[PDB]
């Protein structure tokens, strides 16, 4: 039961708006905050929400290895944990997606016997899916760091989505405040041409940082990436999306074993991927679609559909547990004592909260029968 | 321009807390809200924020194809757009990650000339990285839908992370209110055994849905997945993580072209980055404080900010308006329509700040907020 803890949170990519409610609540409650963001409005916002913040960005330098910077960032955080304080680290995007020092600091804290947790956030890949209008499900997604992709000769799959981070710093171990001199970029272009061909599309993607900005979603051929004026547009916040070159055929034995039967591989569900070369759009309103739409006119909810049927007192406390870290800590320490303290709950509601199981909370908030809960 | 718009937003996975500030503000501002979420506290919260909501979940049914439900969900949203309304759709997690009807509705709205946008959210994969303590960077990540993975015989990489969604409904095209009868699950287990071997680990992952819950992070062998009591635990909110078998060797041409090692020295001999992946079988222990780490820590005592580091140096008025543009959708729409007229209306801005806002470029905003 050591005093001291480390919680690392994200801010998302687009200024302020892409932070989660829980990231904000933990920042506000912290004894000490350490942050690494690249948007001045987000920095200003953080400084209005906690009185004891330190900017980690000052530990980068011209010609200084990023690994040295990361060791320093982690040590600054853990030093405050060792003094018995509740410390929060903040990184832009998702704090564990292409971020070294967060994973390091949490592992050191855990090894010394302190509580340590990462809260997820909205990454640049999350933004890419939203802005390019693609789903990782169709037809699968491979995600790599650009230098690692080359050095370990990581496998390509020409039938799935490909996403490459850190294309602006190929083979570069250090930092510069004015930007990278990305003079090994041509090595990446050679690999892409060898796998996909000279005329295959590469989408240069930069998510908007400020709320009024449009994203950069510029299509180039692989061969165009050798032109000096195009290559120089690729910087420190650039990600590449490379769409599929072909569609993979279905396995007939698997279709038999799953029992689904010939399958046309070039037969798409609406909408088609706009970035695939020479792929026409599909029909949105086939006869099967029109039949489903006609059924709306006299639709009734199924008998097994259970509408929400809660109270203000119950919704208030469930919201409080999600938005007030201190209330959550009190509940976790003593479910029974906490449940007895909440004003205006019914006997059914109070018993369900003491248990805290999914089945019990659902019975209470949807007015479903339960012999135990109705006996309260 | 044409009246009517569609904005689709997410709620994250863990109840209420994983919703973004902008998802909340767009829900509040909407003329009508359509939602599909799978816990009651999140549903109750949404209903406190807008008086005009419809639950899309009522359009599922026992034995009804999910494709028919998806067509209906998308049509209810687009019908309201065609009436000239600003409509918001809401899906749990990230609204475009393993979600069919959002992409469909947005594509139809855009093709008919209406404004259409998706706002990203926190997905189950984002939660998985945070709870299992892994980074997609190290050593790469492949992500698939479980049935698609099987039907198209999609490749694995034994040297990278593998993440499989929808492992609880293999080959199933319909819906049931009481849950799926996942009787083709053995076909997935056979494929995993062929690619990885019977004793390789598979992590059964379920992110906590309520704020007091712990995640499920249960490691099993591929062979253990054939045991009835274990297979029964895999349901509609289950995801699988399969760690690498081993570390992959480096390409020698690439080491030379990137100038990463002098000739005559043996490659792939540096220790792994700390910390090691705790799920990878036979992973060696990595030490946190090597000589290079201890030297960096010694330098902290007399560290000064570099000359090129630019401290924030802004004002209440400028910070307030940039926050407003992020948190008030109406204010953002006004600003976008006429930058000059909006910037003239803002109270207490300096002439430098007012001009910077009127331009709106990143270089201009940064100049104003760091006093350069
Ligand atoms: C050090 S990593 C940090 C990523 C971050 N934690 C996240 O969640 O996306 C930096 C890389 O993230 C990607 N990135 C950062 N900001 C971006 C943006 N606005 N648009 C596209 N990619 C971005 C680029 O690939 C960049 O080289
Ligand atoms: C229809 S999809 C929707 C995914 C959602 N949009 C997201 O952003 O994660 C359903 C699948 O998501 C995954 N999933 C949903 N909730 C989850 C949870 N609490 N933990 C782990 N995986 C989950 C499972 O693989 C499930 O079969
Ligand atoms: N990962 C590096 C470079 C990203 O381009 C950083 O720490 O910013």
Residue numbers in the entry:
A (entry chain A): 7 to 267, 272 to 280, 281C, 282 to 386
B (entry chain B): 7 to 378
Give passages from the manuscript.
While chemical methylation of an amide bond uses a strong base to generate the imidate, OphA, the precursor protein of the fungal peptide macrocycle omphalotin A, self-hypermethylates amides at pH 7 using S-adenosyl methionine (SAM) as cofactor. Omphalotin A derives from the C terminus of the OphA protein, and it is the OphA protein that methylates its own C terminus using S-adenosyl methionine (SAM). The structure of OphA reveals a complex catenane-like arrangement in which the peptide substrate is clamped with its amide nitrogen aligned for nucleophilic attack on the methyl group of SAM. Here, we report the structure of the peptide amide methyltransferase OphA including complexes with cofactor [SAM and S-adenosyl homocysteine (SAH)], cofactor analog, substrate, and product.
The full-length native protein was refractory to crystallization, but an 18-residue C-terminally truncated variant (OphAΔC18), which lacks the sequence that is methylated, was first purified, crystallized, and phased using a selenomethionine variant. Structures with SAM and SAH bound were determined by preincubating the protein with the cofactor prior to crystallization; high-performance liquid chromatography (HPLC) was used to confirm bound cofactor identity. Apart from the addition of the methyl group, the structures of the two complexes are identical [root mean square deviation (rmsd) of 0.6 Å over 684 Cα atoms]. Even with prolonged dialysis at 25°C in the presence of 2 M urea, we were unable to remove SAM from OphAΔC18 to generate an apoprotein (4 M urea unfolded the protein that we were unable to refold). Compared to the Pro242-adenosine (of SAM) interaction in UIIIMT (which binds SAM very tightly), OphAΔC18 makes more extensive van der Waal interactions between Val243 and adenosine. The C-terminal region (Ala252 to Met378) of OphAΔC18, referred to as clasp domain hereafter, is not found in other methyltransferases and comprises extended strands and a helical bundle (Lys322 to Met378). The monomer has the appearance of a ring, with the C-terminal domain forming a thin band, which is closed by interactions between Leu333 and Pro335 from the clasp domain with Leu27 and Ser31 from the N terminus. The clasp domain of one OphAΔC18 monomer wraps around the N-terminal domain of the other monomer, giving the dimer the appearance of two interlocked rings (catenane), a structure that is rare among proteins [reviewed in (20)]. The location of the cofactor relative to the protein is identical in both the OphAΔC18 and OphAΔC6 complexes. Superposition of both sinefungin complexes with the OphAΔC6 Y63F-SAH, OphAΔC18-SAM, and OphAΔC18-SAH complexes shows similar consistency in the protein structure, cofactor, and where present substrate positions.
